[PDB]
Design an enzyme around this catalytic site. Sequence first.
Site, PDB file in Angstrom:
ATOM      1  N   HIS A  41       0.849  -1.227   0.000  1.00 43.74           N
ATOM      2  CA  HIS A  41       0.000   0.000   0.000  1.00 43.74           C
ATOM      3  C   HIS A  41       0.872   1.260   0.000  1.00 43.74           C
ATOM      4  O   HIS A  41       0.282   2.355   0.030  1.00 43.74           O
ATOM      5  CB  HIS A  41      -1.052   0.028   1.118  1.00 43.74           C
ATOM      6  CG  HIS A  41      -0.535   0.171   2.506  1.00 43.74           C
ATOM      7  ND1 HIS A  41      -0.758  -0.796   3.462  1.00 43.74           N
ATOM      8  CD2 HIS A  41       0.120   1.174   3.128  1.00 43.74           C
ATOM      9  CE1 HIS A  41      -0.213  -0.425   4.600  1.00 43.74           C
ATOM     10  NE2 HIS A  41       0.328   0.784   4.427  1.00 43.74           N
ATOM     11  N   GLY A 143       2.841   6.285   9.564  1.00 41.57           N
ATOM     12  CA  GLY A 143       4.247   6.128   9.140  1.00 41.57           C
ATOM     13  C   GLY A 143       4.894   4.881   9.738  1.00 41.57           C
ATOM     14  O   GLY A 143       6.062   4.572   9.358  1.00 41.57           O
ATOM     15  N   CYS A 145       3.848   1.711   9.430  1.00 42.56           N
ATOM     16  CA  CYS A 145       3.670   0.566   8.496  1.00 42.56           C
ATOM     17  C   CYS A 145       5.039   0.175   7.915  1.00 42.56           C
ATOM     18  O   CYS A 145       5.806   1.079   7.537  1.00 42.56           O
ATOM     19  CB  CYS A 145       2.641   0.882   7.412  1.00 42.56           C
ATOM     20  SG  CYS A 145       0.972   0.471   7.984  1.00 42.56           S
TER      21      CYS A 145
HETATM   22  C1  LIG Z   1       0.184   2.082   8.311  1.00 39.93           C
HETATM   23  C2  LIG Z   1       1.124   3.233   8.042  1.00 39.93           C
HETATM   24  O1  LIG Z   1       1.883   3.645   8.924  1.00 39.93           O
HETATM   25  N1  LIG Z   1       1.142   3.731   6.797  1.00 39.93           N
HETATM   26  N2  LIG Z   1       0.069   3.573   5.941  1.00 39.93           N
HETATM   27  C3  LIG Z   1      -1.172   3.954   6.291  1.00 39.93           C
HETATM   28  O2  LIG Z   1      -1.361   4.965   6.969  1.00 39.93           O
HETATM   29  C4  LIG Z   1      -2.308   3.086   5.919  1.00 39.93           C
HETATM   30  C5  LIG Z   1      -2.317   1.663   5.781  1.00 39.93           C
HETATM   31  C6  LIG Z   1      -3.613   1.181   5.482  1.00 39.93           C
HETATM   32  C7  LIG Z   1      -4.550   2.166   5.391  1.00 39.93           C
HETATM   33  S1  LIG Z   1      -3.903   3.748   5.645  1.00 39.93           S
HETATM   34  C8  LIG Z   1      -6.008   1.959   5.108  1.00 39.93           C
HETATM   35  C9  LIG Z   1      -6.363   0.516   5.372  1.00 39.93           C
HETATM   36  C10 LIG Z   1      -5.392  -0.391   4.710  1.00 39.93           C
HETATM   37  C11 LIG Z   1      -3.989  -0.251   5.282  1.00 39.93           C
END
Ligand SMILES: *CC(=O)NNC(=O)c1cc2c(s1)CCCC2
Lengths: 304, 304
Positions: A41, A143, A145
């Site tokens: 993602h 951030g 993820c």
């Molecule tokens: C998780 C992170 O730190 N970075 N990405 C995101 O903010 C998101 C991951 C997802 C989102 S927004 C919507 C649902 C699916 C995974």
Amino acid sequence: SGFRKMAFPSGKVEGCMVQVTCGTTTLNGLWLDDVVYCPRHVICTSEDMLNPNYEDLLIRKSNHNFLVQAGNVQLRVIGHSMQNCVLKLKVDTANPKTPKYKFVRIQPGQTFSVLACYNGSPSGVYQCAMRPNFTIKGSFLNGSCGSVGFNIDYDCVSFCYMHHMELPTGVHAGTDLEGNFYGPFVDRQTAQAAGTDTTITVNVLAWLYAAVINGDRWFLNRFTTTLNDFNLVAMKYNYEPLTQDHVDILGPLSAQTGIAVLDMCASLKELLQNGMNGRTILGSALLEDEFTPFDVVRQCSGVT
Amino acid sequence: SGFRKMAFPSGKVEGCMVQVTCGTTTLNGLWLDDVVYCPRHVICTSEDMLNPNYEDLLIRKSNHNFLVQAGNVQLRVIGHSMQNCVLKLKVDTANPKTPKYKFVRIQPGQTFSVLACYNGSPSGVYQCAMRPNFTIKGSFLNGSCGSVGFNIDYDCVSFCYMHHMELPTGVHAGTDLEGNFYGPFVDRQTAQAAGTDTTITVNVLAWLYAAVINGDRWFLNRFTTTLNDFNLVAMKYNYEPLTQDHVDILGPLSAQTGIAVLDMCASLKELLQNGMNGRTILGSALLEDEFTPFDVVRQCSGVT
Ligand SMILES: *CC(=O)NNC(=O)c1cc2c(s1)CCCC2
Ligand SMILES: *CC(=O)NNC(=O)c1cc2c(s1)CCCC2
């Protein structure tokens, strides 16, 4: 003496964290050999999150759209591919800090350390369990993820978790390092409810053993029980059913303490039926279920 | 979202841990620049522990009696001296992994990460507080002495603790990196009782703020109180008295949440007077006092 929620030393993993940026989305990647692993993602806008077609989104991306920074040095991306819900970015440099490592898909109830990261930089380390509903109860901000969960066996890092999702209930979903979600979760902004968060019975018993070893014994009683009797009580309190496998795994703690597993079960039964009556066990007012029997042996025998 | 007892990443400290052996006593040392810091009781036999004269014991020791191993490579000792309760071993090699660092003596209530070590090898990392009675509630087995507590500010490691002692009550005593004990403790096998382990009130309030931020709000009430009224209740429950300094330190958490410090105090007062009634706050059944206001800001703002 003393018993603490202990993470593995994070150094070997600190040396693997990089920043991945695709357009305006930044998150963490794991650099092992000449591959950087990250949540797919990364290729999405928050707009995209509602119903992303990752295959179609990825067609629009080239190697040079994937900006990989290791500390302050940019890595050259010579290849990209999607494996389940992770991207693999082939870079032209092997990570000189690549420890010995494995990818392992863990079972629910199994514990691991998380190195929470932002912009490819470590902020902290804590110990987790894979809950029986395949969530983890993490600490993750925007951030975070691409932060990974891991175990270390002497010098080998077994990577078991990459962080992808927060569910609307503030619990955490993610993948093994093959990019397969734990549980039924998808990398999509949609209704995803966690199932029943049940207590990891075998871990609680392990932690009752850890308590006796460290001198907390007030909850040892005169009673015993049977697997079937105990399990009737476990059902009622949304505890995982205890198997002969669990009993076997508790054998060494049983042996060291001289308290039979089924006697400790009868202790746990009384705690479930009567509560702690305002007392504490290893400085906790509820039954801790995020130490495994392996975790208790390790911490009580000072394995490095 | 989610709130976790988080340690600093331990990598920068892992690179500093060595094994010190003097005769048949082995424990951990901290290798910074061309000095290895370790508990002076490395020079003692367990016989010696009853009433050691460290000055006299040390006269019998030469540089070559101090065996310093860094991973599998022996360091040459060109100098030794006793500073309070630590030894400084001058070695002929600067530690190439010496991070930016400071020695800081912390105040009671302040939190730090411990890298528990055996034979100069890391086994785990957990978060601690210096208790108001100058003990820490650690996890330390035989061979753990010389393990260090630390904070990290971006790239600077502030070393605040070296592990020396377990008290007969299974709590932990030790020194700053100048070898001065926290509290009245001595490196001697003798009657040493801890004083009252009081709750770090300002840390509990910080953790109540962390809970509101992460959605646990059931304990927010309609009431307020005053510093003096709150402190009457704090006395009764062996909580540290709350000062205007503590109120000031909670200012940013106050501001972010829009809950005045004295209102949160009145929430804490009700929790002390009524207990949790079988409920939980950030997955704990008692009032957590080992997050500082600094720790809560950091974890809630993802500082790396
Ligand atoms: C998780 C992170 O730190 N970075 N990405 C995101 O903010 C998101 C991951 C997802 C989102 S927004 C919507 C649902 C699916 C995974
Ligand atoms: C603490 C450790 O891991 N290594 N040394 C020891 O076992 C001892 C430290 C002290 C002892 S025994 C007796 C009291 C004074 C400190």
